[PDB]
Each structure stands twice: as C-alpha cells, then as structure tokens.
Amino acid sequence: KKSFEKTLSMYPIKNLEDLYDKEGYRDDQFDKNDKGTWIVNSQMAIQNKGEALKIKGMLLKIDRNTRSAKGFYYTNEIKTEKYEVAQDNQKKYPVKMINNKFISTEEVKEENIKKEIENFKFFAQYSNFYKDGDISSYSAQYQLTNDDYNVKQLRKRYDIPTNKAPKLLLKGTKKIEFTFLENKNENIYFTDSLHLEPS
Numbered sequence: 001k002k003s004f005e006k007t008l009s010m011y012p013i014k015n016l017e018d019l020y021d022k023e024g025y026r027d028d029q030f031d032k033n034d035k036g037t038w039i040v041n042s043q044m045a046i047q048n049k050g051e052a053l054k055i056k057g058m059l060l061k062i063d064r065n066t067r068s069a070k071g072f073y074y075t076n077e078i079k080t081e082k083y084e085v086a087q088d089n090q091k092k093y094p095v096k097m098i099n100n101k102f103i104s105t106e107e108v109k110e111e112n113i114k115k116e117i118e119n120f121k122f123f124a125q126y127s128n129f130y131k132d133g134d135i136s137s138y139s140a141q142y143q144l145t146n147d148d149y150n151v152k153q154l155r156k157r158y159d160i161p162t163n164k165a166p167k168l169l170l171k172g173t174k175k176i177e178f179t180f181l182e183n184k185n186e187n188i189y190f191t192d193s194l195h196l197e198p199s
Contacts, residue, residue, distance in 0.1 A: 004174075004176075008129035012126055013124045017097070019040075020064055024196030036197065036198065037062060037064065037065075037198070037199040038061075038062040039060070039061055039195055039197055040060045040124060040193070041192065042058060042191070044056050045187065046159075047181075047185065052079040053078040053079070056116065057191075058095070058102065058122065059074065062097070065199055072093055073102070073120065076091070101118075102117055123176075127192075130142050142168045142170075143167055145165050146163070148165075154166075154190055158190070161188070165180075166180040175192075177190065177191045
C-alpha cells in the first residue's frame with residue numbers, strides 16, 4: 001500500500017512541468033549523469049454493448065536532463081478477445097509538452113482529435129489520494145463508491161456508460177486501474193501510471 005503513497009501523495013500535480021524537478025527512485029541501471037525520464041500514461045478504455053473496445057489516452061516522456069517532454073496521443077479499437085492483425089486501428093498523434101499544454105508537432109486534420117489533445121489532462125493532474133494478491137508482483141484491489149473523489153473526477157472528464165462503482169487496482173512489480181465493468185466483451189476501465197526510468 002504505502003509503497004504507492006510515495007507517489008500518489010504527490011497528486012495532484014497540476015503543472016506536469018514540476019516533474020522536471022521531482023526526483024524519483026534511481027538505481028544502478030541509471031547512469032550517474034542521468035536524472036531520469038518520467039513516463040506518464042493515462043488511458044480510458046470503453047466497450048459499449050456489442051461494440052469494440054475503444055481506447056483513448058496519451059503517453060508522455062518527461063526528460064529531466066533536457067527539461068523537455070515528448071510523446072503522443074493515441075486512439076485504438078479492439079474487437080476480439082484474441083489477436084487479429086487486420087484490426088489495424090491504432091493511431092498515434094505526436095505531441096510535445098510546452099507550457100503545461102500538449103501541442104501537436106504534426107498536422108492533425110480531424111477537428112475531434114485536435115480538441116481532445118487541447119483539453120487533455122493526465123490523471124496525475126486532477127486526482128487526489130481488501131482483496132490482496134502477492135505472487136513473488138503484488139496487487140491490492142478495493143471496491144469504491146461513486147462519491148470517491150477520483151471516481152467523480154473520471155465521470156466529469158469521460159463519458160462512462162455504466163453507473164456501477166469501479167474497483168481500484170493498485171498493481172505493482174506502479175500502475176493503477178479503475179475497472180467499471182469487466183463482463184465478457186463488455187469492458188470499461190481507466191488506467192494510469194507514473195514511473196521514473198533511464199533516458
């Protein structure tokens with residue numbers, strides 16, 4: 001648990017640029033001159049009944065050495081349980097972080113993608129912080145209510161087509177997941193992660 005608090009206590013980080021000056025856990029795989037890169041990823045996955053799993057998220061690499069951040073917005077559609085190559089639905093839209101905003105470094109023609117990038121917020125920017133697995137790979141999973149501050153935050157920012165209260169999974173080897181629905185071919189989950197890794 002409080003292995004998560006070392007990270008989650010930081011939330012919210014309204015200005016992600018503060019991560020330039022936030023030190024994380026460095027180990028002998030980090031070179032002595034590498035301050036590290038924060039990899040931040042937030043992602044909503046929504047599957048309406050009889051429809052494909054629709055995914056939208058952003059991945060950002062915040063390089064502490066160069067005080068710059070690059071990554072991409074991404075959308076995807078997943079239809080089957082198993083791997084089908086021809087579902088080539090993954091689109092990536094490269095962005096940079098400039099003044100705590102996310103800026104396309106390419107042309108984006110679809111007005112609907114432009115808006116999503118312009119208004120995007122990572123979970124770390126707006127959040128605030130039973131059933132235990134441990135296979136040495138630990139996890140703790142909790143049943144939340146719809147008055148949980150973070151559940152309300154998700155329902156504002158995303159259109160969640162179920163009113164069931166999600167479970168929060170703290171998965172660690174780190175990564176967090178709000179699972180709203182987990183029926184067969186009817187999945188709704190939000191994930192987020194923030195970790196420091198070598199550049």
